[PDB]
Amino acid sequence: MDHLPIFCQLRDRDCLIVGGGDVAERKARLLLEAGARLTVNALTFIPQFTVWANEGMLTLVEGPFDETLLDSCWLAIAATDDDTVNQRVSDAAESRRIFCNVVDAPKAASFIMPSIIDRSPLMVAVSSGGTSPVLARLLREKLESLLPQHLGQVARYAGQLRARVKKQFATMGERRRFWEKFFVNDRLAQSLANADEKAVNATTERLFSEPLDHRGEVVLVGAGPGDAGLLTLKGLQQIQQADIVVYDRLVSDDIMNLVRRDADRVFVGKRAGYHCVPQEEINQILLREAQKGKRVVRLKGGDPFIFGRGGEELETLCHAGIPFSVVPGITAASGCSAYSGIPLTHRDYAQSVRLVTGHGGELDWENLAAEKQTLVFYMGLNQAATIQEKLIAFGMQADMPVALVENGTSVKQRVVHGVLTQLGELAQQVESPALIIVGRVVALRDKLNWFSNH
Amino acid sequence: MDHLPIFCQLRDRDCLIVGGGDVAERKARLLLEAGARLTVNALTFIPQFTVWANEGMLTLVEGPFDETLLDSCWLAIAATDDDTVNQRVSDAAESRRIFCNVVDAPKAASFIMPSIIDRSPLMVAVSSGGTSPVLARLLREKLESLLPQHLGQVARYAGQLRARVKKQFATMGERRRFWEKFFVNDRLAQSLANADEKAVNATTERLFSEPLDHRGEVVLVGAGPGDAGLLTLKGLQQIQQADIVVYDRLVSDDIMNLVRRDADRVFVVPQEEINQILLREAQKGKRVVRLKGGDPFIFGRGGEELETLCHAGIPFSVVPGITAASGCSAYSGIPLTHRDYAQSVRLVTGELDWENLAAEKQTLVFYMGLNQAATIQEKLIAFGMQADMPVALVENGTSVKQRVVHGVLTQLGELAQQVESPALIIVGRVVALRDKLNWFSNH
Ligand SMILES: NC(=O)c1ccc[n+]([C@@H]2O[C@H](COP(=O)([O-])OP(=O)(O)OC[C@H]3O[C@@H](n4cnc5c(N)ncnc54)[C@H](O)[C@@H]3O)[C@@H](O)[C@H]2O)c1
Numbered sequence: 001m002d003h004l005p006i007f008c009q010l011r012d013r014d015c016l017i018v019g020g021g022d023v024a025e026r027k028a029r030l031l032l033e034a035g036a037r038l039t040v041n042a043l044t045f046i047p048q049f050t051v052w053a054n055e056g057m058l059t060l061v062e063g064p065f066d067e068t069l070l071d072s073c074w075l076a077i078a079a080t081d082d083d084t085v086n087q088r089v090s091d092a093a094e095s096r097r098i099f100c101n102v103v104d105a106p107k108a109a110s111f112i113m114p115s116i117i118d119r120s121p122l123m124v125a126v127s128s129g130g131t132s133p134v135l136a137r138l139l140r141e142k143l144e145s146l147l148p149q150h151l152g153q154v155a156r157y158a159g160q161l162r163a164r165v166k167k168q169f170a171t172m173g174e175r176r177r178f179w180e181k182f183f184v185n186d187r188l189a190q191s192l193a194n195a196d197e198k199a200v201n202a203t204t205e206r207l208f209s210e211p212l213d214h215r216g217e218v219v220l221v222g223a224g225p226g227d228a229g230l231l232t233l234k235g236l237q238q239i240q241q242a243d244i245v246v247y248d249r250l251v252s253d254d255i256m257n258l259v260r261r262d263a264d265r266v267f268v269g270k271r272a273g274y275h276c277v278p279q280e281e282i283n284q285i286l287l288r289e290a291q292k293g294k295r296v297v298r299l300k301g302g303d304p305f306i307f308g309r310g311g312e313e314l315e316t317l318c319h320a321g322i323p324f325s326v327v328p329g330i331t332a333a334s335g336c337s338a339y340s341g342i343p344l345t346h347r348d349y350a351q352s353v354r355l356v357t358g359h360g361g362e363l364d365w366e367n368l369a370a371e372k373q374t375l376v377f378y379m380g381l382n383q384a385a386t387i388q389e390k391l392i393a394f395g396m397q398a399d400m401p402v403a404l405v406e407n408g409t410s411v412k413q414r415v416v417h418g419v420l421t422q423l424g425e426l427a428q429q430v431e432s433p434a435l436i437i438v439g440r441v442v443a444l445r446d447k448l449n450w451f452s453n454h
Numbered sequence: 455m456d457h458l459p460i461f462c463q464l465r466d467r468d469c470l471i472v473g474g475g476d477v478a479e480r481k482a483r484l485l486l487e488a489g490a491r492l493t494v495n496a497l498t499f500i501p502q503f504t505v506w507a508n509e510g511m512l513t514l515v516e517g518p519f520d521e522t523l524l525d526s527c528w529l530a531i532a533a534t535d536d537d538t539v540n541q542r543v544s545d546a547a548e549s550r551r552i553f554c555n556v557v558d559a560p561k562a563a564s565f566i567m568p569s570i571i572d573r574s575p576l577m578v579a580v581s582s583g584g585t586s587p588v589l590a591r592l593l594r595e596k597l598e599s600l601l602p603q604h605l606g607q608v609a610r611y612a613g614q615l616r617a618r619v620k621k622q623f624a625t626m627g628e629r630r631r632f633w634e635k636f637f638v639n640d641r642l643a644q645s646l647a648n649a650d651e652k653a654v655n656a657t658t659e660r661l662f663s664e665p666l667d668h669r670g671e672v673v674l675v676g677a678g679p680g681d682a683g684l685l686t687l688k689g690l691q692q693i694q695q696a697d698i699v700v701y702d703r704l705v706s707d708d709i710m711n712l713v714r715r716d717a718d719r720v721f722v723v724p725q726e727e728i729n730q731i732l733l734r735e736a737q738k739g740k741r742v743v744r745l746k747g748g749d750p751f752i753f754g755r756g757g758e759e760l761e762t763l764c765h766a767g768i769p770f771s772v773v774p775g776i777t778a779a780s781g782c783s784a785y786s787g788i789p790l791t792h793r794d795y796a797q798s799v800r801l802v803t804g805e806l807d808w809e810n811l812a813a814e815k816q817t818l819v820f821y822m823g824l825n826q827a828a829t830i831q832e833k834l835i836a837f838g839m840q841a842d843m844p845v846a847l848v849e850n851g852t853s854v855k856q857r858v859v860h861g862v863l864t865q866l867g868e869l870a871q872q873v874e875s876p877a878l879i880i881v882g883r884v885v886a887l888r889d890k891l892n893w894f895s896n897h
């Protein structure tokens with residue numbers, strides 16, 4: 001151990017920062033967030049320092065380094081770009097035993113300022129010990145995605161339950177399992193952040209009212225079009241806490257490897273081409289397994305409420321009193337749009353975007369063939385030619401640009417394009433899953449293409 | 455934050471622990487491993503202290519607490535079994551501006567000792583401030599597993615190559631790329647672990663003898679509607695390692711907090727002026743991130759902000775985000791599509807083509823139309839849309855301050871005054887599903 005990490009209480013405690021540029025400002029933002037009684041000493045200050053000074057957040061001392069400024073300080077930071085002046089601040093700080101950070105050089109002075117993950121009162125800090133700040137950022141990034149946003153809410157709330165926990169749970173092992181369940185309860189954390197007193201109570205009691213080993217709930221999660229990177233942070237957090245993951249084929253492999261490892265997996269997808277699971281049964285197992293006290297995650301391709309009906313898999317939960325929630329995901333329209341260089345909206349081209357089903361009651365042609373609009377078809381490859389003919393017939397121009405995006409956002413993403421009179425033809429050049437994009441925005445791809453094609 | 459974490463260098467710096475029992479011992483163990491010049495003042499002492507005493511790893515002062523033993527110290531730790539002596543210690547520490555910790559009283563004194571996960575020189579610290587000690591112990595376990603054992607080796611080697619890296623690569627980004635390649639090489643990592651200097655040098659030499667790109671870039675990143683957890687993993691990575699971030703007001707502050715604390719930031723300033731800020735900064739060789747609300751290629755001006763970059767020879771890429779239409783609807787318990795309800799969805803702007811928009815077997819979503827709302831219902835109703843059709847206006851979707859108002863067309867213009875921007879307007883049948891599917895707020 002080359003450094004001893006410690007967590008300092010800075011509320012209304014004197015601290016000094018020497019410097020007034022951009023580096024000093026970050027140091028001040030941080031110190032202020034911690035509530036320090038801050039004095040900033042520099043030759044010149046950037047605007048944000050004037051803004052704070054003018055709303056009582058800190059004190060400014062314009063001029064060179066005044067050593068007496070350290071006489072009652074608990075922390076000092078050298079943040080000027082003059083190595084000799086920083087040296088004097090450090091020396092003046094060390095002579096009076098004041099922890100000081102020289103910020104240009106990390107191991108020259110008293111303490112290192114680590115990369116922080118703030119979930120107050122819960123906090124994590126990572127340090128390179130001065131070797132690699134790059135590594136520190138890599139860790140902060142990974143740690144931020146793993147700690148839910150409102151984790152601090154439950155850390156703070158735990159206090160108002162400690163007594164009740166010791167009273168119903170008399171064995172240390174039991175009380176620990178309680179906290180393990182309590183600390184991953186994201187719905188409660190959200191309710192507290194929303195100041196939803198009834199749900200906070202409703203969710204607090206279900207925590208004491210249900211069997212200890214039960215964590216019944218259903219979470220609909222949008223996996224995104226394929227790229228594991230397009231999963232949302234909450235979606236990852238939910239996926240790492242699942243007891244059972246119910247998924248279909250449009251959920252990527254990379255996405256599934258992020259699942260927790262012997263968290264049971266239930267493939268409700270269309271097997272070998274011919275065996276798909278009827279919806280009521282998928283609905284029933286989600287309700288059934290949550291009733292058994294399992295944290296159920298329904299992993300859907302793209303987004304849950306856009307042509308992959310989580311609506312159906314949910315209106316049966318809000319009647320068994322099975323708490324539930326929804327984590328939207330990047331829909332194929334958005335993923336493919338961004339990865340093919342085809343904006344769904346651009347300056348003149350259009351400002352009405354339409355997400356339409358492909359192939360009960362069929363297709364409204366001149367609502368479609370009309371324009372100043374961008375058309376995006378989901379599930380329409382076996383109806384591509386039948387879309388071509390029924391679009392030019394109702395007025396759409398034959399030279400209207402079109403494109404097909406297969407396996408959007410994935411390492412095998414294929415993009416093909418041309419003009420409308422080539423649609424059905426370009427479609428027999430692609431396989432499912434793919435989207436069709438009809439619109440003038442398709443020409444923007446010559447200026448915006450950035451992703452590799454296959 | 456209620457605490458500020460710092461990593462202190464304790465080598466040759468005096469420290470004081472008052473107390474000499476089991477609690478005092480573990481604390482002394484850390485101070486010693488951190489290399490502090492330690493002094494332990496205690497009425498009685500357990501065996502290990504004596505052991506440390508004759509190897510010369512510390513000094514022992516037998517007897518009651520002496521306030522002057524703090525006069526040369528940088529840190530004071532109170533670990534007696536006497537609540538009264540511990541505060542005499544913290545009052546003596548405080549009067550001398552010496553950070554102090556009282557072990558069984560975390561709400562007191564000036565600093566709390568966090569749980570540590572050691573991978574020297576790499577180190578991670580976790581704490582609750584005493585609010586949820588079980589939470590911090592649970593996190594420590596998980597982190598002990600998540601963090602490879604030999605991570606310190608890679609980190610130690612990274613520091614050693616620092617000097618050569620700078621004197622081989624001229625810019626800021628060939629070195630950023632050097633590191634990205636460095637920390638991704640599993641051969642180099644495995645090689646350090648089995649001290650194979652042949653494999654470490656071989657791989658290292660090829661890293662240095664590589665042609666790395668110096669140019670910067672622009673990366674359009676969707677921040678989503680507001681909720682920070684709706685940002686994508688890649689979106690987080692991009693804002694976590696950017697040089698400068700250009701953001702608008704539709705980027706919630708919780709998301710702005712996820713940005714590199716080391717990056718510069720420009721609030722936004724005409725599209726054309728904004729357009730220039732991007733390529734200019736990329737020109738300098740910087741990694742620019744244009745953080746936009748919702749999704750960049752849907753009613754943002756993402757296309758415009760990129761269409762000249764190719765002409766300029768500036769690398770770019772796009773990271774999609776949850777559009778406001780997807781986030782608000784889902785968070786308001788209104789799915790954009792259901793059973794046979796509507797299988798066609800429209801995202802619109804705030805003349806327009808009302809007959810194509812009042813028609814149905816479709817769902818409508820209006821961005822930017824809170825004050826053109828009266829003309830939408832007057833026009834929609836006129837062009838054929840049934841006035842018992844439910845509508846909804848979502849204010850600050852996905853956020854902790856979200857509000858939802860519902861009703862019917864004939865009230866549209868009215869409800870539009872119950873809310874303010876940023877708000878979204880959902881027209882369609884699926885809005886009736888709100889209370890059969892509502893899950894975020896009772897608001
Ligand atoms: N160590 C570094 O200087 C360093 C480290 C990393 C990044 N940077 C980069 O440099 C850019 C800004 O540097 P910056 O943060 O220093 O901002 P800056 O260059 O604008 O300001 C530096 C501060 O040092 C002060 N200063 C200089 N001589 C002084 C003296 N004799 N007495 C008192 N004050 C003195 C000025 O008052 C000024 O407020 C940053 O945006 C960051 O990218 C700097």
Ligand SMILES: NC(=O)c1ccc[n+]([C@H]2O[C@@H](COP(=O)([O-])OP(=O)(O)OC[C@H]3O[C@@H](n4cnc5c(N)ncnc54)[C@H](O)[C@@H]3O)[C@H](O)[C@@H]2O)c1
Pocket residue numbers: 472473474475476477478479495496497498499500517518519533534535536539
């Ligand atoms: N060997 C022992 O002293 C011993 C053995 C068994 C139980 N206990 C009792 O010790 C108490 C535990 O205290 P703890 O939680 O800190 O555990 P602990 O094991 O850390 O022991 C407390 C320490 O405080 C030191 N000390 C106490 N008051 C002091 C003072 N005013 N000035 C200087 N030094 C002082 C003693 O050297 C002792 O080592 C409990 O009452 C427990 O019943 C003590």
Ligand SMILES: Nc1ncnc2c1ncn2[C@@H]1O[C@H](CSCC[C@H](N)C(=O)O)[C@@H](O)[C@H]1O
Pocket residue numbers: 225226250301302303304305306307308330331332333336377378379380405406407408409410432433434435
């Ligand atoms: N990676 C991908 N690339 C292109 N299209 C995709 C895709 N993933 C899904 N799709 C489209 O989505 C259709 C299935 S319907 C499910 C869509 C999903 N709920 C979403 O929000 O994206 C497929 O037929 C295909 O047209």
Ligand SMILES: Nc1ncnc2c1ncn2[C@@H]1O[C@H](CSCC[C@H](N)C(=O)O)[C@@H](O)[C@H]1O
Pocket residue numbers: 679680704746747748749750751752753754776777778779782820821822823848849850851852853875876877878
């Ligand atoms: N949190 C939020 N709640 C409701 N509407 C929002 C919102 N954030 C953005 N919007 C909508 O987006 C409009 C600005 S245009 C930007 C839209 C963004 N590119 C997206 O894809 O969602 C606002 O006027 C509002 O209508």
